[PDB]
Design a binder for this molecule. Structure first.
Ligand SMILES: Nc1ncnc2c1ncn2[C@@H]1O[C@H](COP(=O)(O)OP(=O)(O)OP(O)(O)=S)[C@@H](O)[C@H]1O
Ligand SMILES: [Mg+2]
Ligand SMILES: [Zn+2]
Lengths: 48, 670, 166, 91
């Protein structure tokens, strides 16, 4: 009457070089766009 | 800063520099200091750069393998860390060693400006074989934390699977445009292409695997019966499975005692063929790195039994050594020992130092170790100089200890007991493999003893049906099996060394010799020597025997006797390079002795009659005596010594030719 | 090993070798063989019956003059004794050699007679050595003394000759 | 002493399988730092575990540095550190 085995992961190595069409890189670029965009002197999307 | 491989503590640059410095600057005097041997340091050999000259002769011979002693890493100061890194992480440290060996091979001709081309050396893939990695702890005393560590093991090879092709490069062909690709194996997995690689043809599932165009490598599985130095309480011996690869395939034969150093591996095994479900309990095996088939404690294998195997070793470039390399100094030492006047008594005395007297018994054991000459007829016949010795006697005559010493001193013998052996277990049998679940052939004791000495203790307790197998072994050195899966003749060129007691468990002078021995005539005549080893009660003999067995207990670790290493290499050299021949003077002595024994046998069973096999035994014993003294010819005194040994073994001087009985106080001298 | 004689009962008519139906080799492998004869007597049967009836009534040993040692205590003492590895000096080796010589001459002399228990053996010498080493182990000494060999020879003698001669 | 204590022994004797990881979690909560440094005469599992602990520490430090360098609110230092630690340990 045992439990369900669980699966977990941990980052170790660099892996393959990232590609621009990859979903993770698109998400990261979008995140940097939200955090780092300035209209005149303010992060308008961060404040919004 | 400095980079470390994940999961380890190993740096490629640091290990490379340390091993390069070790290879450039090692001397065997470091090994002398490490083993606490200062008085044995010599100028001409120890002070020479060991691995420099070994890599040089590696370049001249075309050798691509370096045999590395791990104890030498402990001898050097800078590589004492690297030693541990070789034991804990063989997989990458061995690769580091191979890469820096290749660098050293380049450097030895780049720096010194030799005429060798660099293209041949840099095309070659040099690999290292570490050995002597530590203490030989058992398989069953190892733990899952020892997975992927270097381990050293003792063992006896029982059988080996055929050559198995393991697939390294895969060859895929398109069905419609005949476009092919080759993909390398990556950690046991091959990526089959879903789509054709061509720009013009991109049809899905059009790539099919062509099994004969793709490249394979050799993989063999050997079942090894382990003999640990330490055995725990009530541990029953087991068999391991060891996997050899590439060159090491077919380097181990069934029945040899070998020193395997390799990598402790574990894999999960599929529960069913159709399903990819694996078992949680893992299967352990040894991925073999180096095999040592030579011990200085015991004799080297007979070269006459492995001639085509040595040729195949040369062809495959497996280059695992089968016999000891004899230098010039030890060769000169072998000759100067061979020129000594009392060499016969010296070599017989050095057989079993813990066994007192039994001088003629030890002389016969020595001659059986040397063996007669092996003659191969051009027509197709074959004569094997294998001496068979029976030791019948009273209890406690150190004869079982003689069997134990001979079993330890021979290369590939098997020790058996009377009636603890069967006829099927001596020849061959069908077994079930645990891995393949298939019917496999496995060699019995006599076939496993080919090239060595089969020791049979309590030969009188063996049943007659089991005893009937030995006849063909002692007459033709073969066993001709016609069974359900086997119809073949197997070579068993094994010398039989048997031990026996009389019927009454003590020799009876009132009974004759033949009744006391209690072996049938077609069996006893095959023995070259029959030793009646009797316990006679004396004053001085009992005194000296008591002193000999009592000085053994003076200390915890107990004339002139040779060391066991020198005795083994002397006998190995004499067996390998000396093949004496019979001259006419020896022929006259042999014929006259045979006719004399046949005339003595005319008197009226009660007595051992002379035999044609006794003439052949005289020939073999004279040849072994001539092989001892490094003579290429058998002289007359060799025949006289053979006759003397045969007559003194059965105590023909003590016995009465008429009655057949043996007196004790009259003629016998203890 | 535990065994009965040939007919199930020892009879003094035949030799000790005769009713010990046992081959000479396997006899020589035993260091000590005890003839355990059931000889009737008025006095010993009294004490045996008193002992057995006391054990049956009280579920305990009769004699209160000694405390028997617990099995765990004996086990740990025997382990600590087994840790020892006693050795022999030249004088005790000489005494063992002389005892062996006299034993072999006695076995030669008694071979023709009916009182023979066998023929003396180098295994008898090794058994004397091993019994002496065990006795030195019980004393927790790294040396085998003369009294250890005395006890070993006495034990060998009382194993066979003492009960049969009586 | 008079304080109230639960019957932990009976709870272990009834349900020891859960109390195995309960003790393991408690032991890992207060684990002393090793006095001796790691070396080449050390086990392979031990160096793997040391590398795993150091790698976890590097993840925590790097994510703390990235989140602090983002500077979302540009503003209570202790509460800010606690919230940043909690978001790092959950992300
Ligand atoms: N002449 C001897 N030299 C050295 N050791 C001896 C001699 N005679 C007896 N021994 C020792 O005495 C013991 C007797 O055992 P073994 O002689 O091996 O038995 P055995 O001679 O094969 O006779 P069995 O076993 O009854 S067939 C061993 O420990 C021997 O080493
Ligand atoms: Mg024996
Ligand atoms: Zn195609």
């Amino acid at each position: 009457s045992f439990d369900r085995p669980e699966i977990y992961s941990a980052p170790v190595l660099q892996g393959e070089s990232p590609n621009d069409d990859d979903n993770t890189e698109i998400i990261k670029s979008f995140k940097n766009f939200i955090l780092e965009f300035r209209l005149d002197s303010q992060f308008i999307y961060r404040d919004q | 800063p400095l980079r470390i491989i994940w999961g380890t503590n190993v740096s490629i640059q640091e290990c490379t520099t340390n091993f390069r410095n070790f290879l450039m600057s090692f001397k065997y005097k470091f090994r002398k200091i490490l083993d606490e041997r200062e008085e044995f340091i010599n100028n001409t050999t120890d002070e020479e750069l060991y691995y420099i000259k070994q890599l040089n002769e590696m370049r001249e011979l075309g050798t691509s393998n370096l045999n590395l002693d791990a104890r030498n890493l402990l001898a050097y100061k800078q590589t004492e860390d690297l030693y541990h890194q070789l034991l804990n992480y063989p997989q990458e440290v061995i690769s580091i060693m191979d890469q820096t060996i290749k660098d050293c091979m380049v450097s030895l001709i780049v720096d010194n400006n030799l005429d060798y081309d660099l293209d041949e050396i840099e095309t070659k893939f040099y690999k290292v074989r570490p050995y002597n990695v530590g203490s030989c702890k058992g398989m069953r005393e190892l733990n899952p934390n020892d997975i992927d560590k270097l381990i050293n093991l003792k063992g006896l090879v029982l059988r080996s699977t055929p050559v198995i092709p393991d697939m390294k490069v895969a060859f895929f062909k398109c069905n419609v445009c005949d476009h092919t690709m080759a993909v390398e194996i990556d950690r046991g997995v091959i990526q089959e292409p879903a789509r054709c690689e061509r720009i013009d043809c991109n049809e899905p599932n059009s790539m099919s695997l062509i099994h004969n165009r793709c490249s394979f490598a050799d993989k063999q599985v050997i079942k090894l019966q382990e003999t640990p130095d330490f055995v725990p309480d009530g541990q029953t011996p087991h068999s391991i499975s060891l996997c050899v690869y590439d060159e090491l395939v077919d380097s181990c034969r069934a029945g040899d005692r070998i020193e395997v150093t390799g990598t402790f591996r574990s894999i999960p095994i599929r529960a069913n063929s159709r399903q990819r479900v694996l078992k949680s309990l893992y299967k352990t095996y040894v991925d073999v790195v180096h095999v040592k088939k030579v011990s200085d404690k015991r004799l080297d294998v007979d070269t006459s039994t492995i001639e085509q195997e040595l040729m195949q070793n040369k062809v495959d470039h497996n280059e695992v050594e089968e016999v000891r390399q004899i230098t010039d100094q030890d060769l000169a030492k072998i000759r100067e020992v061979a020129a000594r006047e009392d060499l016969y008594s010296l070599l017989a005395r050095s057989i079993a130092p813990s066994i007192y007297e039994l001088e003629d018994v030890k002389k016969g054991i020595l001659l059986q170790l040397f063996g007669g000459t092996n003659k191969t007829f051009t027509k197709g016949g074959r004569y094997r100089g294998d001496i068979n010795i029976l030791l019948c006697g009273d209890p406690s005559t150190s004869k079982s200890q003689i069997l134990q010493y001979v079993h330890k001193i021979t290369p590939r013998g098997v020790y058996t007991s009377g009636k603890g052996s069967s006829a099927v277990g001596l020849t061959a049998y069908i077994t079930r493999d645990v891995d393949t679940k298939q019917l496999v052939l496995e060699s019995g004791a006599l076939v496993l003893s080919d090239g060595g000495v089969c020791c049979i203790d309590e030969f009188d307790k063996m049943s007659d049906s089991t005893r009937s197998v030995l006849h063909e072994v002692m007459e033709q050195q073969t066993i001709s099996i016609a069974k359900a899966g086997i119809i073949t003749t197997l070579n068993a060129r094994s010398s039989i060394l048997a031990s026996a007691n009389p019927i009454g468990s003590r020799y009876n002078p009132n009974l004759p010799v033949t009744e006391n021995i209690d072996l049938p005539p077609p069996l006893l005549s095959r023995f070259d020597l029959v030793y009646l080893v009797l316990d006679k009660v004396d004053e001085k003999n009992d005194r000296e025997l008591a002193k000999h067995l009592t000085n053994l207990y003076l200390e915890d670790k107990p004339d002139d006797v040779l060391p066991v290493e020198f005795l083994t290499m002397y006998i190995s050299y004499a067996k390998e390079h000396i093949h004496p021949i019979i001259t006419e003077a020896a022929k006259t002595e042999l014929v006259r002795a045979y006719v004399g024994m046949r005339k003595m046998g005319d008197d009226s069973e009660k007595r051992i009659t002379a035999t044609t096999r006794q003439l052949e035994s005289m020939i073999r014993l004279a040849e072994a005596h001539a092989k001892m003294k490094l003579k290429n010819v058998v002289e007359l005194e060799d025949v006289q010594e053979a006759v003397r040994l045969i007559r003194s073994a059965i105590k023909d001087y003590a016995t009465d030719p008429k009655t057949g009985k043996i007196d004790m106080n009259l003629v016998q001298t203890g | 090993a535990a065994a009965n004689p040939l007919y199930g009962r020892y009879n003094p008519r035949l030799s000790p070798l005769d009713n010990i139906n046992l081959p000479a080799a396997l006899l020589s492998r035993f260091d000590i063989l005890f003839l355990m004869l059931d000889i009737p007597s008025r006095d010993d049967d009294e004490k045996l019956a008193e002992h057995v009836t006391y054990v049956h009534m009280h579920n305990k040993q009769p004699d209160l003059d000694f405390t028997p040692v617990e099995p765990s205590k004996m086990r740990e003492y025997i382990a600590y004794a087994k840790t020892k590895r006693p050795v022999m000096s030249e004088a005790v080796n000489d005494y063992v050699v002389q005892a062996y010589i006299r034993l072999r001459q006695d076995s030669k002399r008694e071979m023709d007679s009916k009182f023979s228990f066998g023929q003396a053996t180098p295994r008898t010498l090794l058994g004397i050595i091993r019994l002496s080493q065990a006795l030195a182990k019980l004393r927790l000494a790294d040396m085998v003394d003369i009294d250890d060999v005395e006890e070993a020879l006495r034990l060998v003698r009382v194993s066979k000759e003492s009960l049969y001669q009586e | 002493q008079g304080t109230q204590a639960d019957d932990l022994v009976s709870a272990i004797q009834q349900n020891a399988n859960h109390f195995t990881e309960l003790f393991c979690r408690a032991i890992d909560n207060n684990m002393p730092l090793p006095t001796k440094e790691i070396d080449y005469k050390d086990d392979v599992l031990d160096v793997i575990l040391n590398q795993r602990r150091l790698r976890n520490e590097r993840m925590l430090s790097d994510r703390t540095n990235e989140i602090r360098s983002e500077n979302l609110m540009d503003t209570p230092p202790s509460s800010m550190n606690d919230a940043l630690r909690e978001v790092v340990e959950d992300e």
